[PDB]
Fold Penicillin-binding protein 2.
Amino acid sequence: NRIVRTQALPATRGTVSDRNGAVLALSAPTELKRHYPMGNLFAHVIGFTDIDGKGQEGLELSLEDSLYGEDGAEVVLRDRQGNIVDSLDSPRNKAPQNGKDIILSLDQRIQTLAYEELNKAVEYHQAKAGTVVVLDARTGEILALANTPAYDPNRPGRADSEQRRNRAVTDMIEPGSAIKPFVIAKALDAGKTDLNERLNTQPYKIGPSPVRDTHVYPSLDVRGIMQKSSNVGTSKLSARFGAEEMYDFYHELGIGVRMHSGFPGETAGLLRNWRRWRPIEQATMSFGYGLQLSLLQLARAYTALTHDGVLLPLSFEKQAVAPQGKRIFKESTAREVRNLMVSVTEPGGTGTAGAVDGFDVGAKTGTAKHVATFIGFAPAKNPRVIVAVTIDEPTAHGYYGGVVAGPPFKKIMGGSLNILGISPTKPLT
């Protein structure tokens, strides 16, 4: 009836909040219990803790060391009913240290928009799954990242491996047409082409392998190559570089290595060693096949186009200032490639569904069973937001990225520009 007991004094796990202070994850006493007030909204980003309040998935896992804190303890005398009878002197008596609080760079207004438009698109096309990434085009901060299917992180025990997968960071895709602006930018940047060169863009063969567009374009300048999304023209520009130089370029865009964003389960993608490339493999790579990267890596790569030739690291934590990046292109080159990419959303372009009323939008689209992709930035001259959308295995009402991932991109980009308070640069139609 007088029993010595070491009583745990649990640390309170750090809070997770959005960039404006909306609370996303917190602990309450029951032992503490982890609460996600906004339910499934941030499921994949934040993840969840196990029964003992250890992070199991997502940022709960990767930020475990700073989030958890340090439990304390005290030695007590209790009775058989459990009533504390005495507090005992002991060197084991230690006060708990609460976890560190985290302010995410994500914005629940944009996350809600992305979430709602993704789900609408996936259901309308009866697709298997989908992903949206929204970045600040100038700092590399992630403003939104959602996947469907998702789950309620408040009840993660009933959630599929498929529901729980953070596809934006874990899954590898062949980028398809989305890689083209980079190849074109490199060619311009290295001075292997220029803005008024006209290329022979007739279909050709590498050995027994044809390289062809959807329609026969006899000749195109750099702009037409962008506009029409020409595989011939892109592969010819890549062909003015050796394998090692192209490889180095892809690698420096982060293809084939892990980003080390701080998210768990990051894919490395795939960049085959250049010593093994055939001319034809180099060709298909210039139009986004035979190499792979995650949607998050793709979206990051676009920061080299939006941040004036300087590739930025991504952040899940609110930044005061743009991180130092790595220069990939001259500022001169990025600026002119941005202007080029506006032609894909204007009439004649492959991605007119991505046009946002009152803005110029630079974009690429293509179909990566298929994976439909749409990626772009606005205002194109002075970009503020990158939006990347992927829809997995569309079943109804289209297959093409421009028609399945295009419309949600338009909604997410327009909504985002409005949420961020960015004025139209041209009259609204």
